[PDB]
Amino acid sequence: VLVLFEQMLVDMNLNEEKQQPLREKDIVIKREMVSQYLHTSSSRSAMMYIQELRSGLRDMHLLSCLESLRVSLNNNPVSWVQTFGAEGLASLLDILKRLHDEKDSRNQHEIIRCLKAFMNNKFGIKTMLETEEGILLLVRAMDPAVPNMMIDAAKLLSALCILPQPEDMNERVLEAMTERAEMDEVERFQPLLDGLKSGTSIALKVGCLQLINALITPAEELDFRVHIRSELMRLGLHQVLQELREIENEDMKVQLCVFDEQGDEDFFDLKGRLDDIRMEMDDFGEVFQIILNTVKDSKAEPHFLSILQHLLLVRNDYEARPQYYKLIEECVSQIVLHKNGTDPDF
Amino acid sequence: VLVLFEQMLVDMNLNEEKQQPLREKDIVIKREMVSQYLHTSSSRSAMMYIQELRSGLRDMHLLSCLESLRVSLNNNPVSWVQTFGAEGLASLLDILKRLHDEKDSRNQHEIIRCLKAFMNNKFGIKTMLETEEGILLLVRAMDPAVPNMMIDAAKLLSALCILPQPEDMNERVLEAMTERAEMDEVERFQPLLDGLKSGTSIALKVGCLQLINALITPAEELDFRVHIRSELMRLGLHQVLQELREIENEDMKVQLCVFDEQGDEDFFDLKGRLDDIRMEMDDFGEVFQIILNTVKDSKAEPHFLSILQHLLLVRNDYEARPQYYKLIEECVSQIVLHKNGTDPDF
Amino acid sequence: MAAIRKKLVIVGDGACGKTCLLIVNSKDQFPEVYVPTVFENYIADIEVDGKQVELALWDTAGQEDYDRLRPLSYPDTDVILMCFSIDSPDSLENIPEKWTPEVKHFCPNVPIILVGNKKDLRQDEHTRRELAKMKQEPVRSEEGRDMANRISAFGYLECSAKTKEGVREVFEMATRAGL
Amino acid sequence: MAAIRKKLVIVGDGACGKTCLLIVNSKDQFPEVYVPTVFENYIADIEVDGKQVELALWDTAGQEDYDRLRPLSYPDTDVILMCFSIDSPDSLENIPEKWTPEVKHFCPNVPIILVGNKKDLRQDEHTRRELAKMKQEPVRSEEGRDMANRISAFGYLECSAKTKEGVREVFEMATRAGL
């Protein structure tokens, strides 16, 4: 009989710990539970939904159906979800698409709720990852004016970024954010800063900061990590952080600590790279060579030139250029080495 | 046909003005209205209630029945009320009695609501006035802790005090308040001051002040009027009035003006009585005679003596008694002639 | 045209806009004045899903002093409109105290539509300043739907006769209900 | 004794006191601990108007992670107890978002009793100070009854297992409902 019981326990999406207390019950109780499980296998099948979702309903009718599909994906045997499978998902995202071409959000929201339930589990996250528009469509779902759907989508994306199994997941996500941003005339961390703004629900703020951390933590490259921090920091992230630091909220407090400490470490490290460079390239002969090899015929070029050009605005004659560069250098150093360095106003 | 129409208009408890617009309609409309009226003459009859009220129900059952009896007394032809008549009332107050011997107030409250509906009209107020315990029972209904029932009872009593037809109505009412107060170990304007207390609903405060005014306005005798004002004023009414005078409430504002102005006039008048006495009794020969005729063998005596006794505490020898009486006199004058004069702390 | 005709009686506190609502549906002019109704009745026509359906509108006095008059109007109602002003919490509070016990007493099992009027006043500058003076604020939608559930109405719609917002929907629901 | 037996399943947010309520009715000792239920079921006996009537009590995990487990319990319920903590507005907010859609999906036309737990915390000094820190206050009765009307429950009773206030009445109503 204890065979079915394993089968059951697998079908209920429970980790090792969660399963503990079920393993301790008497076989007599385990025997009732296999027969409840065997019986209950309270609505339509997978294919009966998939059809409703194909007959193109609208309004209360769509919601009515999505609310019920939500409860099934959520409360049924993981096996049911697999029957719903690649198809269900593809038509779920089909609806989502066609919906944005109306830009009810109760409907978009419900789909997300479904998706959340679908990804709830190992089978789900796998099938979501193989989809063409899945990630992109979650990203489209971060709308500050529809806060709760932004929260749900945000978390779902945060879980993704932190996945080891498929490489560079954070980057998958970031690309989607990038894409949509080119797709409007808008800055890519715009929706995140917008949700940090004061007078948005604390819940919205938290999960905003959570995604920022989720994008940065798992990254192996220092460069990526100092880079995107500076992008946000440039766009005023420091200032938006200040009035949050006084909210007595256990979660908000945790993300600020992760964020701050990320900063210290990342940038303590960049400084230590400087110490290396200072040994390797101790004169212009080394410097000139790097430029010609590493900047010269790359897309980095025009931006690099433009910097050198700004650094040589002063007349050569000027009786105090030493004093002037000693200064420019402190600025430049701050810009590159302090973690809130790209700030418009330090 | 216009005969019935008069009959109808009488049966609906409408004054002359209210009736105006009904008189202006076409006979064709007047003809529909007589036939609606003739038809609708949506529950049990008078005698069917009177029985329910006699079979001694309790709890939700009593309320359920009282809520329905409330709507009938309220929304039916004045004629229906007359069928309910002296009896209905007597058994309504029967319930009320038996209820206080439990000291639900939802029940006591509903009865009051009924009574309000019953007195709503000329027939009602008449029959209520002939009842032994009616007034007394309304008075028992002014409980600060059950605020809304206090409001309803208060107004109902205020309407009474202002009735010309039967003489000295305010006094009828006041006697009832007196009675109950001897009946506890309590001061008779206690419940009124209690309802003026801060943090009771504005509605409660207003109708409290309203009853105070209703007791005093209609009184023909200056004496009564300065008397009961001073009783309240003694018990701190001035102080409780102060924080009310800042409430922006159209009704509360009106009662304060009536109250204040009552004071000025009453007491301007008492002063003018003084001017008379000062002419009539200009020496101790007049004074002594009044005392012996007017105080000596009356229940006023012991209190009067006690005052004279306090006025002659000073030794006769004292080198400054003139100066001392010039003073005592200003106090005594304030006590008797200023409208907030009985104040414990001026 | 043997059209379907249903009785709609409308009731509520004096001056919460029972009459303007009616008139805006029909003639289509908002009266600046305010003449208190004693007893009046209009005929409308309204769409519901392919149907032309006459609607017999019975308007009532909101004032207390007309309580013995109003049951003249209730006899065979098919659906009530029960109203309160959004600029008036007091007018709301009368929904369970007065207007419900009344309507259930005279029309049992007649569907009710709880209707918030003067929606336009919700975000009105003078209104708010005035409601403050009394330790109050305008009616919240949330408050209005909770009430309808409590009296177990057929539903809750809000509207402003002055701007005509939400009006057409008010009468559709009522047409829909009396069916 | 061919006694009448009805199924009562109880559900609600983790830690709003589903289990203490059950246990207080039966053995009559409040557990200081807090061990989260996965799946448990007791038998009670209760009075209703001259009758001794067995009551089959089905206790469920409140935690999210047990969502695929819970429908094991719903199959032939006669009456639900749906709970929230009075010291927890969030726990209330989950009544329409989560617990209602769930119960109506698996047990359609099964009567529901909306139940506010930990009544004793309403006027608790530490609780209020803590709920303030989050821009909130304990649940008002008023808020609880409005919710029950919204999910169209059989009713609303509040109680505190810790003090045993309002408890006997909780289970009477439920007995009464499954009939």
Ligand SMILES: Nc1nc2c(ncn2[C@@H]2O[C@H](COP(=O)(O)OP(=O)(O)NP(=O)(O)O)[C@@H](O)[C@H]2O)c(=O)[nH]1
């Ligand atoms: N802002 C605003 N004012 C309105 C609206 N409808 C009516 N009013 C105003 O508020 C008052 C209500 O008028 P009315 O429609 O007669 O209300 P009523 O409830 O029928 N009156 P009665 O109780 O005496 O029958 C009038 O002064 C009117 O101009 C509305 O939608 N918005």
Ligand SMILES: Nc1nc2c(ncn2[C@@H]2O[C@H](COP(=O)(O)OP(=O)(O)NP(=O)(O)O)[C@@H](O)[C@H]2O)c(=O)[nH]1
């Ligand atoms: N103040 C107060 N605390 C209570 C009350 N009932 C339970 N608690 C406390 O709050 C917690 C709730 O315990 P429990 O009854 O297990 O709740 P539960 O909802 O069954 N838990 P689960 O969701 O995991 O099944 C415990 O720490 C308990 O001691 C109550 O009536 N008042």
Ligand SMILES: [Mg+2]
């Ligand atoms: Mg390190």
Ligand SMILES: [Mg+2]
């Ligand atoms: Mg005079």
Ligand SMILES: [Mg+2]
């Ligand atoms: Mg009108």
Ligand SMILES: [Mg+2]
């Ligand atoms: Mg438990």
